[PDB]
Amino acid sequence: GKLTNGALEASNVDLSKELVNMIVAQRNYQSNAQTIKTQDQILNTLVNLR
Amino acid sequence: GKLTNGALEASNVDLSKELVNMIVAQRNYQSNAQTIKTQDQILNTLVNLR
Amino acid sequence: YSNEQEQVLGQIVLANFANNEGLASQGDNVWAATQASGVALLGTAGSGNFGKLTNGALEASNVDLSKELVNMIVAQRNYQSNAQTIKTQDQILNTLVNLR
Amino acid sequence: SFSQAVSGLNAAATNLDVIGNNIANSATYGFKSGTASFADMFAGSKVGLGVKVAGITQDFTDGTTTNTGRGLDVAISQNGFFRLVDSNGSVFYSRNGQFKLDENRNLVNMQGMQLTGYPATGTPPTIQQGANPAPITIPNTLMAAKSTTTA
Amino acid sequence: SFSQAVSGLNAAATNLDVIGNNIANSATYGFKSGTASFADMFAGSKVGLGVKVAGITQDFTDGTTTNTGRGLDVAISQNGFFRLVDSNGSVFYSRNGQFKL
Amino acid sequence: KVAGITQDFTDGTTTNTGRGLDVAISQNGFFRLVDSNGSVFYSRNGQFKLDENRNLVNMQGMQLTGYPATGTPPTIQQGANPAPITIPNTLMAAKSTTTASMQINLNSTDPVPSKTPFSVSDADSYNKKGTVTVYDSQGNAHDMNVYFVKTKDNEWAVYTHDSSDPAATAPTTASTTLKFNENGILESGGTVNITTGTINGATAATFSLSFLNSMQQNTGANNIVATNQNGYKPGDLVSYQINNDGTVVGN
Amino acid sequence: SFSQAVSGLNAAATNLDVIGNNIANSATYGFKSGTASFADMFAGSKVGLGV
Amino acid sequence: SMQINLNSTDPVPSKTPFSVSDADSYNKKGTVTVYDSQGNAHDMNVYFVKTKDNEWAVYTHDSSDPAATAPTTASTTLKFNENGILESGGTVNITTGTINGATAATFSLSFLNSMQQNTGANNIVATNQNGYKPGDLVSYQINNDGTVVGN
């Protein structure tokens, strides 16, 4: 490295990118919820046909 | 392994995986209900010959 | 390096195929070549049929979940219509049996 | 009678499985989209006999490209493929550029499969493009000093 | 049919809690962020199996060194790590210099 | 009595698919296919892949049949019989330049070049330097410098020199001469069968250079507006398209 | 049906990401604005079928 | 057969005479894997050197036979015209070596439709050979023409 004595290192996060990445995680979580609920209701009509 | 001080060990269950497992368990329960249903009505079409 | 001269340590080989569609995808982001894929011809970035590369930028997935979300409901509704044609096949056989 | 619609149910079930895979594989880098391909059965009978899945294919467009400051995230945008090798020496191909170093300082992906490159031999090395790929070792090997010839 | 989507669910949950870590871990000194990385599973079938974590890998670019009036506040602005031993003699490596006496 | 099961042949909704090799018609036409059995079949599906032999097939491997690309330039033949069409990685071979033309607009107010006789190392011996990059029978680069020298009123000496040939000599004998009318329109001298140099076992290009559509400006600069030729480099392959009227083109 | 809707839905998606690119490259020197020009779909049926 | 496009502007290599181990003694190295009557893989390295304009000394080496002699004679010579059309020496018979008590494989190597590229590098277009490993079984299929097959 090359050390400095007065200055102390802050974090590595750029929390704009984290706060916009949690939204993409939220929405593809919700779309995965959409496909489990649609496999639920196709299996629902696969039962109740008689 | 590395025991910790004040943190508790929270539960193993990830409740999304169980909320889809109850869906698939209840719908093949319903499929088993349909095969006892068809066994019921093939038995009464075996009975009501005479 | 520390004397500020650089030396080449290798070059990332790219590979193309006869068709991309014959690639049998293995159990990762990995694909694997087949008889159906054609044997892979190899080269570097920018020569003929080959890929212009980037340095730090990473390639995201190509799925558009708007088209995925609108395809799941059309697969869902024609699934239910297939359920209803076996349903009415059941009803016409039911009134075919017990007519006497 | 029933064969048409049980074929249709199997077709829509494979279709839903493919697109549920595609929704699940959103935002995994290098994933290419799934697509189903269907075709109808026939025979000597003039009526139709359902639908078979003629095959599952991929969609080979380019994804969008996200600029990450990490320098070991090399991606490509055209028809090429990274040529990886595993621990068993089997050749594979991929487009996920999330590349680690391992202990031995040769470029693995985040699974551990090593890249392949045309090696560079000499002093100073050039592209020894003899069509012979090899895992890209990027060592801490010292820069061997050479003599001045033209000042 | 269903396992692909619950694989997508817990993959997005792994995204969401490592991002909630990094947001909760924001503006501490000498933390270096985490990053979830994924990969698709496949089998003999050409249809899919969902998504798993390939791993939680950290980014090792430098945080912005902030001026602080305390003198015991060293920080590397490059690719070195500190070295720490404990009361049990095990080696450990750090990046912040919150160095009290 | 069931009289028979009829198809209906109205076109379905054409769906915009971002894939490239997915061509589907919307009229009463029919794609033509063949399988390996040798029987010709007719379809309408747009899913078109290519094999490991890189001939365009459907999803079931049945090869598309099309009108061939025969000749140089590749065109249709007078037997009119379709065939399985391929997309090869066989490289586009170069052919010698045969027709090159350069159009020039020279000011008529330009004085006669002073430093006579002509030299290629003397800028004041000519009025205008131009460049046309032609390619020979094997097809390597030849940067033919053409040279424009005002001899007198409306008459322009035109010199040719292969800069790519280190074994060539300087032009000192006249290649041709543009002679213009009173109106500034080219009268004669607007064509020459000019031969390039010979380099590294590739024999020289012997091409028709033309200066048609040139005209003498009255005040301005000596300006080349349009060069064109039919010589080129060996291109291997980059990409390909299905054109909108059916044919396939290869970049 | 769903075809006009998906065609339409995409049109708006590509228009949104192009004008997001125009907002993102604001005050980047020498950048040029981009507009997504669209065009409607027709076939042998009299009713329109997308964009 | 090995079909390959040859750079016409490649110089005569500076390392003279020929060497099998030294990279600058040849214009381009290529590899074809051939197979014998026993079934072992022989990695035939083809070495392209240019002699003068429009013809190439083609030397062959059996690198999978470690007890093999280094070639100092011409395996063949690729002769080209002014248009890059192959002229003569485009098909040559060649014997391989033996190892592990196997039999020697002798095959006809074909360079047909090899073109001489003006500007570029030497790149292998298409190789194909009819030798193959032993194979036990993976699949077996009932094709529609009443023909049963194994793969």
Author numbering:
A (entry chain F), B (entry chain L): 353 to 402
C (entry chain K): 303 to 402
D (entry chain K): 1 to 151
E (entry chain F): 1 to 101
F (entry chain P): 52 to 302
G (entry chain E): 1 to 51
H (entry chain V): 152 to 302
How did the manuscript describe this experimental structure?
Bacteria swim in viscous liquid environments by using the flagellum. The flagellum is composed of about 30 different proteins and can be roughly divided into three parts: the basal body, the hook, and the filament. The hook is a relatively short axial segment working as a universal joint connecting the basal body and the filament for smooth transmission of motor torque to the filament oriented off-axis of the motor.
Here we report the native supercoiled hook structure at 3.6 Å resolution obtained by cryoEM single-particle image analysis of the Salmonella polyhook. Based on this cryoEM map, we built atomic models of FlgE for 26 subunits that cover more than two turns of the 1-start helix of its helical assembly. The supercoil was left-handed with a helical pitch of 129 nm and a diameter of 33 nm. Accordingly, the subunit conformation gradually changes along the circumference from one protofilament to the next due to the supercoiled nature of the native hook structure, although the conformations of subunits are nearly identical within each protofilament. So, although the conformations of the 26 subunits we built into the map were all similar to one another, we identified 11 distinct conformations among them, one for each protofilament. These 11 distinct conformations are all realized by slightly different arrangements of the three domains but the domain conformations are well preserved. When the two subunit conformations in the shortest and longest protofilaments are compared by superposing the D0 domains, domain D1 shifts up by 5 Å and tilts by 4°, and domain D2 tilts by 24° in addition, in order to achieve an overall subunit length extension of 14.7 Å. Thus, the compression and extension of each protofilament during the smoke ring-like rotation is achieved by changing relative domain orientations of FlgE while maintaining the conformation of each domain. The bottom of the C-terminal helix of the upper subunit axially overlaps with the top of the C-terminal helix of the lower subunit to allow their mutual sliding for protofilament compression and extension.
